[PDB]
Structure 1
């Protein structure tokens, strides 16, 4: 594997951010609430190191610069996130990433998910 001696096995001497995109990227819609949607995902196999949290990006535009893209930081190292108060009949692009004690990594391909539609005056 590599060349080097061993002695002070007091953990790692250095960490390497997750330079790999997440897996199990799915985007569903809330039951009853069209303006609300749930985004699930899973940690990458590489996982050069450990995990502490995740970040999701979403914006009406797709060609827009990450700068414009909003940052939805997830707490409790959660693998799922919910976004309410959104627009209907509009193509929204979502992105999921993995960040650890060190930092964040590369974002996955833009997930195009067409928002649902309100069917019936009843909801709840």
Structure 2
């Protein structure tokens, strides 16, 4: 039985890249190769992805942003092979949201016709901790973004009330998520006509 690699470390490079490094004790030049394996910590049922390396490091790419991964290495030299090394852990950096806030809806507030309530769900691809949202509304759907009225939502709140709206007026609403990295994409405009 071959000696498994030691001193396994993870170096975070981006939202999709982690460098894995290790040491091989069976070295003081031959046909040996290392196999790096990784899977996300959660869900616990995740199948391992793996790659071969001929050096004492491997660049794990195509990872998901803001995700914790487990890494382990083994060595093979022909018919002989080792077990999996100690596990190294590494969580990719955050990235701007890459998806809009889901399930956007607008209702009129109970007994307040000039008041509306916006309701939504966090984006599917938040890619980090949501630091807020930005609501935009307009009487004209085709108006340039600066012409839309800005209504910021602080923190991961999933509701926001907008008061003093013109009656019997069709309004248009769209939202974008915000994280430590910036603004994500906008939702498709939802139309709502005030009573």
Q: CA RMSD in A?
A: 4.0
1:56-81 deviation per Cα after TM superposition (whole angstroms, max 9, x unaligned):
00011111001111211112321110
1:22-78 deviation per Cα after TM superposition (whole angstroms, max 9, x unaligned):
112111110000000100111122222221111100011111001111211112321
**Residues 130 and 155, structure 2, Cα contact 8 Å, conserved in 1:** no
Moved more, 9-18 or 52-61: 9-18
Residue 57 of structure 1 pairs with residue 164 of structure 2: no
Structure 2: runs of 5 or more not aligned: 1-80
CA distance in 2, matches of 1:59, 1:22: 18
Aligned pair count reads 114
The structure with the largest alpha-carbon Rg is 2
Which structure has the highest strand share of the two? 2
Structure 1 stretches of 4+ with a deviation exceeding 3 A read 2-14
Which structure is higher in RCO with an 8 Å CA cutoff and minimum separation 6?
Answer: 1
